[PDB]
Structures are given as structure tokens and as C-alpha cells.
Amino acid sequence: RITLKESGPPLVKPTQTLTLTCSFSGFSLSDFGVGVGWIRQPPGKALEWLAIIYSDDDKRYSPSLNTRLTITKDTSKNQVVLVMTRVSPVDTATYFCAHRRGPTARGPVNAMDVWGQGITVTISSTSTKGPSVFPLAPGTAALGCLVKDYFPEPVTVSWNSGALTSGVHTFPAVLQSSGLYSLSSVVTVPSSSLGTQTYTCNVNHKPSNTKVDKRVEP
Amino acid sequence: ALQLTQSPSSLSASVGDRITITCRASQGVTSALAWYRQKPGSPPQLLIYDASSLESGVPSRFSGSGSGTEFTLTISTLRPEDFATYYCQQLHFYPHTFGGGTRVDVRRTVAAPSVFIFPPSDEQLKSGTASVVCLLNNFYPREAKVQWKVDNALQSGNSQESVTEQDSKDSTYSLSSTLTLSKADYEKHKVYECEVTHQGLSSPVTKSFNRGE
């Protein structure tokens, strides 16, 4: 029935301007009291209210981001637009637009009932770049690979070309201060096998067309 | 601003449990409070609107109550689909505030982490940087503390970490922390230690290594 979808650039540069669009269907902004809001969520953080715009063009922004946000609507297109200025790495998050019911049957406006998938936007001054893969050298022993300085996500890691899966922990990459990513992948094994079994992480960063096979040992 | 405090921020439960969680408001928001369930990777999903009204299409197990400053969300019987993060939102005042969230995970016996420390590779040392990493493997509960020490000096502002999601078979978590130093600094010091604090450990455990040896 009601569906919303966010669109825009997944990669924006610090200081540059971020423009997002919310395309919807199953409802129109001419319906009395209808609203469409924007909510963002930094990776691993809580939801943060951004702004709301209604049928009559009534608008409200989050006080903290007020001089940086501008919200508009185009009824001819069933689209709502959010423009955020001078973005920084801290604006890296997932942006969602949502629908808010209008008065019919009163209480149902007290909520945002339908949300869009959300769109992931990353703020970095960095350019595409393959990763460098370093060893994490080792009864239970642990070993791994540090996949460093790559951009942008994602990267894929497997062990022994897929043959090794149990005990594997590929962690979530972290966006470093340099604007580049860094992630580690570890696998826990029996010490006894450290001398007879080989352990190679297979790293693939398609964005840069970079593949690396890293043999790891004591 | 209107503060919305969610309690408890984190919570462990099992399938079939009955849990209730709260959301406190600094000022009265009448009945204008909504509740959502958000599964990892998916957008928020409305459960309760107007504080007590069950949103059409939502399981009868969910319920809500409260008015003014106190509000609760109750799950009569917890299902697998319910291990997620929950949020409340008041839409009585502008701006529309969201709570910090309540994280509900699968409960298992307390498991202390297996700690390993990894020195920087010689190949990386040339790039001009030294990354030493600390692995906290398969622990429970989720909270853990990693403190880095170089020649007994507490390190601050030069590390980053990430946690994996709760394992689907053993319900544990795993954490990774990276201490980043300049090659110069790295060579200027001797002991590199990673001290881990975790409820499954009677006393903080320290894994370390000496740069040359």
C-alpha cells in the first residue's frame, strides 16, 4: 500500500552538499494533514529526528541542524527533498524518510507508520583505493588478517578459499580518521594444526578491483 | 530539549519470556508516544501508536501503556523475531524526539572472552604505521572493556573497535580493537598490553608482548 523510498548519493565529500529524495506512492501530499519526515541513524547509534513537512507545506527542522537543513515537496512528483549542507564524517549514517498519518481517529498521527528502506550515506574525502592486507600472527590459537586502508565498502574475506568457515569472525570495518576503512577477520584454531595446516585469507575489494591472498603463520 | 530515556538500555532474554521496557519523558507528552522494533539492517517498524494502540498487522503479544511522562512496551511472550532494538518516539513537541533504544539479545550462560594480542607486521612497519590488535573471542554478555597500555602508559584516542553480532548457534559476541601508532612511536617503546574487563572474568586479564622478543 504505502511505500517510501530514499534516493541520492551514497558517497558525499566533507563540506559538499547532500541532497536526498523521498519518492512515495499509496498516498499523496494533498491528503489532509499528511506528513513526511526524515530520520537518520549513524552506524551503531540511535535514531535521530531530522525534519518534517506536511500537506500545507508546514515545516519543522531539528533545532540543532536547522541552519543546515532545507525540506521541500513536489506534489506533481510525489517526492520530498532534503538538502543538508556542509556535511562532515559525523553525518555518515543511514537516512530514512517516513509517512505520518493525518487526522481521519486522532491518535494515529502519533507515530510514523511506514518507513523507507533507508539509504546509507558515507561522508569521506577519500577516493577509491584497494586495501593492504597484513597478518595477525598466532590448545586454541587465533590468527587473522588486517585489511587496511581501503575505500569504499565493501570488502569480502574468506579463509582457504571458502574451505575454512568454523571459528571465523570477520568484524565490521571501522571508518578511520583518514577517511579510509580498516577491518579484521580472525579464525580460531587448534594449536596442533598450526604446523601442518595452512591458513590463507582471501580478500576481495571489487570497488578497486583488488584481490589479495594472504598466507598467515607464527 | 525534551529528553526521552529508555530503560533498560540493554536486555537479555529467552524465547517465551515476558519483558516490559520503559521510556521516560522529561515533560508530559500526553499520549503522543510511539514504539518501534528495528531488526539489524532493516528500517524501524511501528508496533504501538498513540501510546496504547496496537498498530494494525502487529502481533497481539505487543502492548503499550502510559501517559504523560511514563510509558511501557510489553511483550507477553518473546519470539525469535523479537531479538532486536526498540525505540520510543514522542510526537507532542517539536522536535520529535526518539529514545536511545533498548537492545534485546539472546540470553546464554556468562562466557568470558578468549583474549589474543597481535603485534604489527614488519611489512606494515614500512608503510610507516604500526597497528597492534586485540581479539576478545566468544564472550557473553556483550559488554566488555579494552584498555591499551604501552610501557604502562594508558592509551587514549588512538584505538578503534567493532563487535560482531550475536552468534546464531552459541549466542556469543566477539570484539576487535586496534591500537594505531607511528612506526617511530612503536619502536620507542617496549611492552604492548591489552587489558580486558568482563563480567566473566573475576579480574581483568592482560595479554601483552615485548617488541623485540
Binding site: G33, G35, Y54, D58, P103, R106, V109, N110 | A1, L2, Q27, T30, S31, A32, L91, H92, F93, Y94, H96
Partner: peptide
């Protein structure tokens, strides 16, 4: 704090 668009209806 200013009030939401529908506060007045309650």
C-alpha cells in the same frame, strides 16, 4: 518547546 501540529486536537 513548541507543540506538534496535532496537540490541539486532544
Amino acid at each position: 518547546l513548541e507543540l506538534d501540529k496535532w496537540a490541539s486536537l486532544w
